[PDB]
Amino acid sequence: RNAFYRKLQNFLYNVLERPRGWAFIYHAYVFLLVFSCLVLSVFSTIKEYEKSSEGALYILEIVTIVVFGVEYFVRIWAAGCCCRYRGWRGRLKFARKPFCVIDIMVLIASIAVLASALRSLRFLQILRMIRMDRRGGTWKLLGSVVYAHSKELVTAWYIGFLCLILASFLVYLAEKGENDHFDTYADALWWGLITLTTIGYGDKYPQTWNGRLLAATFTLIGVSFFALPAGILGSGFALKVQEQHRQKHFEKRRNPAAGLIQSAWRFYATNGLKVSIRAVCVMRFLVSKRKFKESLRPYDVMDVIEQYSAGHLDMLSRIKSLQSRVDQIVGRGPAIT
Amino acid sequence: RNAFYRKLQNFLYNVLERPRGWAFIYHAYVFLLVFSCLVLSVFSTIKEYEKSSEGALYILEIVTIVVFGVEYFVRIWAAGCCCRYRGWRGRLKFARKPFCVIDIMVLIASIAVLASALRSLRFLQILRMIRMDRRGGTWKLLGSVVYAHSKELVTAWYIGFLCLILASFLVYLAEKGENDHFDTYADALWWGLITLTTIGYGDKYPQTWNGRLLAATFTLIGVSFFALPAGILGSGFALKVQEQHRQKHFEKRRNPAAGLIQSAWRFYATNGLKVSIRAVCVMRFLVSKRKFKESLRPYDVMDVIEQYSAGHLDMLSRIKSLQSRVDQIVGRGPAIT
Amino acid sequence: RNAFYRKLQNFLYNVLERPRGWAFIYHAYVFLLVFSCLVLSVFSTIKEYEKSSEGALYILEIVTIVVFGVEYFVRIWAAGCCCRYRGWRGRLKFARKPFCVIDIMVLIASIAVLASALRSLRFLQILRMIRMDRRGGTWKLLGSVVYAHSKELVTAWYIGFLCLILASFLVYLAEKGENDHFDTYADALWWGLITLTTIGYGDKYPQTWNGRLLAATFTLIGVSFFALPAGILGSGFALKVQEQHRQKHFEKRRNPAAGLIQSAWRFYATNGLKVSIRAVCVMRFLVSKRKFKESLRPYDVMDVIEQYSAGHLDMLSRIKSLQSRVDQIVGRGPAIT
Amino acid sequence: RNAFYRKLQNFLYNVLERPRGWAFIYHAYVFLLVFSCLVLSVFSTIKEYEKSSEGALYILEIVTIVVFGVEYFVRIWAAGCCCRYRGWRGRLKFARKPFCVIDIMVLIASIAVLASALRSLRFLQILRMIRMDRRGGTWKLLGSVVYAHSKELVTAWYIGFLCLILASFLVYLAEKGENDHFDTYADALWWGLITLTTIGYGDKYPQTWNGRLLAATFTLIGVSFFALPAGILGSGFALKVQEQHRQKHFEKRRNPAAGLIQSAWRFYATNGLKVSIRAVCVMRFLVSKRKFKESLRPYDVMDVIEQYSAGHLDMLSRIKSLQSRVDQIVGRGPAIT
Amino acid sequence: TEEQIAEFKEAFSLFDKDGDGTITTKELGTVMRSLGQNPTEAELQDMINEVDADGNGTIDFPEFLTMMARKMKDTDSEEEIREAFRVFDKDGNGYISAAELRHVMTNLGEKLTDEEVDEMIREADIDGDGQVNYEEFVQMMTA
Amino acid sequence: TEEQIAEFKEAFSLFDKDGDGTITTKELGTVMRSLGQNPTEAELQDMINEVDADGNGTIDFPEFLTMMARKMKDTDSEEEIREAFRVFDKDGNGYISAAELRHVMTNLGEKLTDEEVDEMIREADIDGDGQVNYEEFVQMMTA
Amino acid sequence: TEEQIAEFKEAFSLFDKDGDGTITTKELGTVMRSLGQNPTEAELQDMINEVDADGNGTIDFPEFLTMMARKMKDTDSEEEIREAFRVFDKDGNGYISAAELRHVMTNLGEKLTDEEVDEMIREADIDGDGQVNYEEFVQMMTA
Amino acid sequence: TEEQIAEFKEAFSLFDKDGDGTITTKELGTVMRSLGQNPTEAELQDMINEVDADGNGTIDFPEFLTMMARKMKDTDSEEEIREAFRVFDKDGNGYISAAELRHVMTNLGEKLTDEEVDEMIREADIDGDGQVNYEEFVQMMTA
Ligand SMILES: O=C(Nc1ccc2c3c(cccc13)CC2)c1ccc(F)cc1
Ligand SMILES: O=C(Nc1ccc2c3c(cccc13)CC2)c1ccc(F)cc1
Ligand SMILES: O=C(Nc1ccc2c3c(cccc13)CC2)c1ccc(F)cc1
Ligand SMILES: O=C(Nc1ccc2c3c(cccc13)CC2)c1ccc(F)cc1
């Protein structure tokens, strides 16, 4: 019973904390529920659909708030399982963590609105949406990629910024009076931003033919530069996720190495209770050796290069040994002859 | 005659099923015909061009339906050739497959409309368009790439979603009353979606200068994030197709390996009818050896690394042998001297 | 004089034909001149600027036509230099080539217009623009890349096409009557195409809120898919140009190999006129050896892998030799002892 | 004092010149200040906000100009520290450099405006913005990438240009009279440019159904081609920055190599003042050896391949030595037996 | 030898409770329970195929004897232990701190009791320097 | 030797039906038809160039004799058979199940009859363990 | 030997001013100041761990003696000097100009005085050709 | 030897027309004109640095003698000729058709007259098979 209770507590902890499988399914369902709440709130903001939208939203936000409260209670109950935090004081000491603070203040805000409120509801829904990460993984990846490609991103930013400013000013000069859109430089800058980003609202567009020519000559290069960072970030994301996969592979290598070394030592030192013990030990040895050698999957050219270069250095040592032996034979030659 | 009939049946089967060359040409022609039917239907939906459009569409859909019917009959006739399905019961058992069900229900729907129908015609044309794959290859590739890059795609989704929501809400606040476009939050969300995707219809755009500034500050990052997944998917598609090519190369390696081993065994064991037999056998041996060694094209750095590391391990074994021999000579030295 | 005349003829041929340096500068200048002619024609098409535009265009097209005529004459004169075509009949036989036909018919059309003409002028200017390649290099690269990435491009085409059709039909259903934009399916398809491509003219946009929701749900995926092929083609272009560079590097390797082998044979066979001859020959030998070894720049991991694996196979042969010698010593051991 | 003064001068020089850490923070702050000046000028250009905008801009540009002047004076004072320029004449000789000229003329222009001026203010602000680089790093990277991918970029330019011209002309023909937007070819070209770039202002769009069909058929390929260069440039930027990182790694390898060789020579030649000297020398030797071997991080497959191929050539030399020794033993065999 | 063969017969009889001459997965599970360790079905199946040469789903007595006849040098595991120790040797110094050994055996894989790590230090750390090279460990283990 | 040379002359006469001293592609096709196998023109041409040293489009008698004078050790095919067996050895265990041998010979390349695979098992599977290593197979085949 | 051990005791006493038998980082800094060189805290700590085998933060006398007992051939630095000289040999000719040696020692790393580079040229440039191969330098240094 | 040294002195005197003991680039150009070949300034400079050990811009007589004292085995060019012939051997058969030799010497690099390619075939194609292996060519050339 108590052991079952602890096993539950810990499985539930892992599900709420870093999950693997169907725990992702539960997280997807809770995300879908909060997303439905958000869209229903959006509809409620409409005037015509206010009645039914609010009617459904009341029950849906009731369900959302009760689910969030029970999940907070369950998370706190779970934190007591990990050795870092146990008993009464441990759970509170865990709750001192800032993410606990954001989650709990979201909960109390939701309860307070439960028991101009539209703006507060929107704010709390956005905060809940942010809360759905729980690990900063997306933000960490984005920041890491941006830092990695800081030079190219800064190049794109600076060049596109200069292009936008220059094109906007030139068009403004070419359309100061003819086109009422560009009566001020700020309007020209707005036009430049909405074009170079290829949004092209259409509220402001050049009409003087010379202005149109300048707009073309600059929009070519401007749109190219403004599109650059999208592809740069895509490549960065791919590279960084590949790097994380490589590191995970190397850790999955590290563990079976320990397993193999331990089992090999046991098998060496274990040399019909005793015969049975040695049999099971050597059996474990072959199993662990197979597991480790399987874990030694290259996964990358550099990886296999390293594994082979280790053997190549071993080869160098062996050929040094053979050089020593042949030198000994050569020295013996005259000595014995 | 009967052998010719079977050879036909099977060639026709392969053409209808996984094709290689001019069978792709026939498939392209049938796709072009159904596409012409679709565009003619689109024109028929126009009011002015209704007469001629429908006149041509009648004959074109007659041709389409007869072609589809004959192709279905031919496919069923062909399934009897493959050993999985032969005779009478085998063809039906093949037709139990779900894709057969979708194709046949499309056929019967087309016949039923043949003998408010515009909506049904559009639905059946879309279903036919879907049917043109016949292998899920495109869908399989897309799903595989999405799963492979799930982390980066989810990062882009989450970050762009948060950016859209936040920017939309902020602009809505900055343009609640001044601009009639953003009278409700839903309108603001629509604006945010059509801008961050760079579509920029122009029906709704900010006008308050502070609203314009917020729109700029958020649209930069928003458009970058919304463009990310395009490049991510492009890279994923390239990688996955490269992987399929690598696997195909390795299978094309696997087959000639069998050929070489078989022919080498025959040549070894065959050692003027007998002399002629051995001559042809060894002749086959050299031919198969050449074919295999040609098939051993690296195609990749990792591939050549593997092929060379095998030889390097062989080298390690040989140097161990030489170490053993030199140790024997060293031990003999004192023994004989 | 005659030798100087031939050297000129050939240098001029190479400049007109595959150029390297400042010949590119001349080609850029002629391209700029024809481009100026085109833009001046565009301005002439305007009503207000017709007078000055046509005044300048007359002289500019006179210059263009005389330059093109002299270039054609010079090209024909040059073709007589290459051994494939010499004398009188050779130049005509060269002119039988189709590109000669397109160029010459462009020339005669330009002369005919020189001595509703606006449409013919536009056509001839476009044909001249096409002519500026002279090698199909751009078209060859584009076609090669498309063929290489046929699978991913076809995936994008099929999926985006289905998405466009489905989204257009669904919106049309959701906005059949409410929005006058979508009174017919063709209008819906036009909207879908101009949105999924992110062009977003703004003439047609959904207004029914359910239609707006469908438009959002489908435009996300649609714009992603429509953007895919741009990145796919970019990657393909980069890969193909890299491949051409690799092939060029390997040819630049091939030539110095011949140089080295020839010079090494001469140096070997040449073993104070005779001493001077041998001195210059060996001098050439070291020079050619240095040139070749410099030409052996890896340029790629696979390249160095190949060059090292050749030496590794040599190592295998040498270790086989050493195994043979050690076996001989082992066999001698008992024999002599 | 004097030594402290020189150390200051040089640290300040490096901060102003190529900076590493918090010097980037100072540069970011000055960039932010000039950017705030620019945005405040933009607001001043508006009519309503003129009063407060100009009020704040006066003090902000006073701060900007004094900061720029003091930084110019400090830069000149710093140039005297570097050995290239010392004393009185050296600083002026440094100031002869063109970037000094642009900076100083910006300063004098700012002072002159300080003591229709809006246009001059905009020009000087743009020039300041350009000045913020101080090394051409962004421009150098962009130009290098463009040159590297000249072939693909030229392919995209030529193909997209032809597509734009052809599509524009065809639509113009299809909409010469029906749509007032395309009354002239120049309008058609403007439409083509704003669509193929996916800007899609919406001022001009085809309306004749045949014109719409041509617009679709050409806009697909046109938008693909116009989007190509963005991704091409992104890949080029990533590759070039990776190359610079590789070169930096190799220089960081070059320096510790010198350190190791020097320290190894000292340790070899140094063989209780003398014992203490040798102890410290060998201590330095191990430290420098560790630093260098750490500096020998592959960082790349080709790098490790080179480092291992050096050892492989060494192996070839050693196996040649062993072949020589075994040949000697074989020759001795008969001689002694 | 014959005495070793008889010892192996006794071991197998202790294993093959069914007595059919094959150690079924259930028999292996029961004996391991006797040892107190907790096996899973999949890991046990992997075990059988690792030690089974016939792939019949059980371990016939001659296969078991051959396994007991397989000595460490016949295992051909020198390269694998090389690679494992290399994985544990981050710096590539050729050694690894005895503290690192204790930590890694006590916090990875099949955790070893203090006695085991102590005896490993005794046998492998012949030099008694705390930094046990992998060369010496593997050569002593195999020889 | 001279007896072998005369045997090769008889073989060539059986081959070169034209009697001109060269086995034209048509003669090779006819003889192979006699053997009942089905050759194609391209594969036959490849055959000739593989066995032809002059590249004249036919096989003159001394080239044929040299081919018959080429022994397996002189073929220098050890590496190729190494690589083939490695390709078939997915796990890299150094062996491959006799069931795998039967399957692969019977479902890939020039399919071999049951007799051939049985005799291959006999000669190569000297240990009779069902797992034939490639080392032993290639060394026996070459030696 | 015993005489060398006594010399090392004298050296350590000159080092371990505290006299506790361990050379603390401060003692190393003071002695190096005596030598006039400028050490930093981090570089000194790196120094200790490089020469410290116990990792106690100081250098006990037997560790110091072992360091003095470590000879160049026992350093196992041949590969490192190989790689350094290869790095300096851009062309890969197998040598490097004596002018290049002077330049690189005088403008990289711990700059060496003219006397040091001259004696290096003397010992390594045995052939006196100005192009000193790395093979000869490293073999003379180690042997 | 002394006779060879005197022969080299005569060769240098024929080279160093200035008589200063150094063959300036102009002297090399004039002598090569005597040979009828057409050198360029850059290629000639490359020539000097290839054969010049002092880098003084000219070839002093000791350097010229040392060049004449450098034998092919001392050149250490075996690997380079290996790689060249490998480049020419597309199929990797280990040989190359004599027709390929004639074609490549006659249409690449410093084109060789028919006599040269014929004598190359004679010496290298010892087997007279038209397919000259690179092993035999390089070993004969070096030995
Ligand atoms: O690059 C990003 N956003 C810009 C894209 C394009 C351009 C810009 C400029 C200035 C500032 C920004 C960007 C000029 C042209 C971007 C930043 C952060 C992020 F999380 C995702 C994307
Ligand atoms: O990434 C895809 N579609 C989004 C692109 C960009 C963004 C999104 C967001 C939420 C949901 C979706 C997408 C926020 C920003 C996409 C999905 C499926 C597919 F087949 C092809 C493409
Ligand atoms: O992929 C190209 N063009 C499409 C882009 C995007 C999509 C398409 C579809 C159908 C047909 C075409 C394209 C559906 C979505 C494209 C073709 C040729 C070329 F030269 C350059 C680019
Ligand atoms: O490729 C660049 N800009 C074009 C993009 C797309 C297209 C073009 C064409 C002609 C001239 C230009 C571009 C036709 C289609 C581009 C240039 C310079 C730069 F710094 C950044 C980007």
Side-chain angles (χ1 to χ4, degrees), chain F residues 1 3-9 11-70 72-78 80-143:
Chain F
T1 176
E3 202 285 321
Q4 307 173 264
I5 288 168
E7 291 165 340
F8 302 146
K9 148 264 291 177
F12 201 92
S13 66
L14 302 162
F15 287 7
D16 181 20
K17 303 329 294 179
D18 175 296
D20 55 319
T22 75
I23 322 169
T24 72
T25 308
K26 294 292 141 273
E27 290 168 304
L28 161 45
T30 59
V31 59
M32 197 165 140
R33 296 263 44 69
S34 79
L35 329 167
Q37 303 283 343
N38 62 93
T40 76
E41 181 68 299
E43 103 188 79
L44 281 193
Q45 164 44 270
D46 273 2
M47 271 205 198
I48 322 314
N49 40 265
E50 272 282 284
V51 302
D52 197 30
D54 61 31
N56 65 1
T58 64
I59 298 314
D60 52 44
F61 177 73
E63 283 157 344
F64 156 77
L65 215 163
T66 314
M67 300 325 88
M68 333 325 297
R70 144 61 51 81
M72 104 303 295
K73 56 203 72 53
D74 316 288
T75 54
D76 168 351
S77 35
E78 162 53 53
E80 321 227 323
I81 309 190
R82 183 51 41 61
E83 190 36 45
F85 261 71
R86 199 276 295 288
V87 152
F88 275 114
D89 200 354
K90 174 72 221 83
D91 171 71
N93 53 29
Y95 305 82
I96 165 176
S97 82
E100 282 153 328
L101 281 293
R102 299 203 165 252
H103 183 297
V104 297
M105 329 329 302
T106 56
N107 320 288
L108 288 98
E110 177 63 7
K111 298 191 181 193
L112 282 193
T113 82
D114 183 20
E115 306 91 358
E116 279 86 10
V117 316
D118 307 327
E119 50 176 358
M120 211 155 58
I121 296 160
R122 294 197 190 104
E123 202 153 9
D125 209 357
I126 66 184
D127 50 52
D129 78 331
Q131 305 289 329
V132 47
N133 182 302
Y134 10 92
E135 283 322 76
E136 81 205 12
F137 179 102
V138 304
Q139 60 88 42
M140 161 285 308
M141 191 319 299
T142 188

Side-chain angles (χ1 to χ4, degrees), chain A residues 31-305:
Chain A
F31 154 80
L32 166 145
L33 191 136
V34 60
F35 185 65
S36 272
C37 159
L38 162 53
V39 62
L40 264 290
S41 168
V42 158
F43 270 121
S44 80
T45 317
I46 287 281
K47 290 319 301 178
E48 191 277 344
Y49 306 79
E50 182 153 350
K51 43 138 187 196
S52 324
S53 174
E54 168 145 13
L57 193 53
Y58 198 76
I59 64 172
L60 203 73
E61 66 81 12
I62 292 291
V63 174
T64 286
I65 187 150
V66 305
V67 158
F68 280 18
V70 62
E71 290 321 287
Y72 175 93
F73 274 20
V74 165
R75 150 171 90 149
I76 284 298
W77 183 71
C81 89
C82 92
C83 303
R84 298 185 140 205
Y85 303 105
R86 285 243 179 191
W88 319 320
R89 302 183 168 180
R91 291 173 171 173
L92 281 301
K93 192 158 30 177
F94 154 69
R96 316 285 310 115
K97 295 178 180 180
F99 197 87
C100 318
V101 158
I102 178 152
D103 157 17
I104 190 190
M105 68 215 193
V106 162
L107 314 176
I108 65 192
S110 62
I111 273 290
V113 74
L114 184 144
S116 172
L118 74 171
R119 270 173 57 175
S120 92
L121 169 63
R122 278 161 210 104
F123 269 118
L124 71 83
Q125 291 171 295
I126 295 176
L127 264 283
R128 295 164 143 172
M129 280 315 342
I130 294 196
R131 211 271 301 169
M132 298 304 100
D133 191 29
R134 266 172 84 76
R135 285 198 305 294
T138 59
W139 304 102
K140 280 183 187 183
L141 167 52
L142 160 59
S144 173
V145 164
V146 165
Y147 178 88
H149 304 258
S150 94
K151 195 185 182 190
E152 323 90 306
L153 285 197
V154 161
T155 319
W157 299 351
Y158 182 63
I159 293 309
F161 171 87
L162 284 193
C163 184
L164 157 60
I165 273 176
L166 181 31
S168 184
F169 178 72
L170 256 48
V171 162
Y172 164 94
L173 290 190
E175 296 224 335
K176 182 43 170 153
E178 278 56 5
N179 187 319
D180 55 43
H181 295 135
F182 304 89
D183 61 348
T184 77
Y185 184 62
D187 283 358
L189 279 179
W190 172 253
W191 160 87
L193 176 73
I194 61 162
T195 61
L196 292 197
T197 52
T198 82
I199 303 184
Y201 276 130
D203 61 359
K204 305 174 164 39
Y205 53 93
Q207 273 144 313
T208 64
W209 268 253
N210 309 12
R212 286 194 173 181
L213 168 139
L214 293 182
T217 283
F218 268 86
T219 179
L220 293 170
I221 80 184
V223 303
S224 310
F225 279 114
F226 277 65
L228 250 170
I232 275 169
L233 291 181
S235 86
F237 279 32
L239 288 207
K240 230 73 204 187
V241 66
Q242 222 89 71
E243 159 169 312
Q244 319 310 358
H245 290 12
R246 196 148 192 280
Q247 288 180 7
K248 211 58 51 202
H249 186 71
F250 282 9
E251 307 322 273
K252 293 212 302 177
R253 261 193 198 172
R254 157 156 315 296
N255 182 25
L260 163 149
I261 282 153
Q262 297 166 316
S263 174
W265 168 242
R266 277 213 203 98
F267 152 81
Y268 171 83
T270 192
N271 58 350
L273 72 171
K274 165 141 173 53
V275 293
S276 38
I277 295 151
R278 182 144 211 281
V280 57
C281 181
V282 64
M283 150 58 108
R284 298 269 208 67
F285 170 84
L286 319 89
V287 165
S288 168
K289 137 168 173 179
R290 193 222 51 64
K291 205 161 300 179
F292 177 79
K293 59 146 177 278
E294 160 53 7
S295 156
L296 289 192
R297 273 299 79 67
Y299 168 86
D300 186 338
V301 177
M302 161 85 58
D303 187 349
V304 53
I305 281 287

Side-chain angles (χ1 to χ4, degrees), chain C residues 142 146 153 156-157 160-161 225-226 229 233, chain D residues 220-221 224-225:
Chain C
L142 160 59
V146 165
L153 285 197
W157 299 351
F161 171 87
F225 279 114
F226 277 65
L233 291 181
Chain D
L220 293 170
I221 79 184
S224 310
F225 279 114

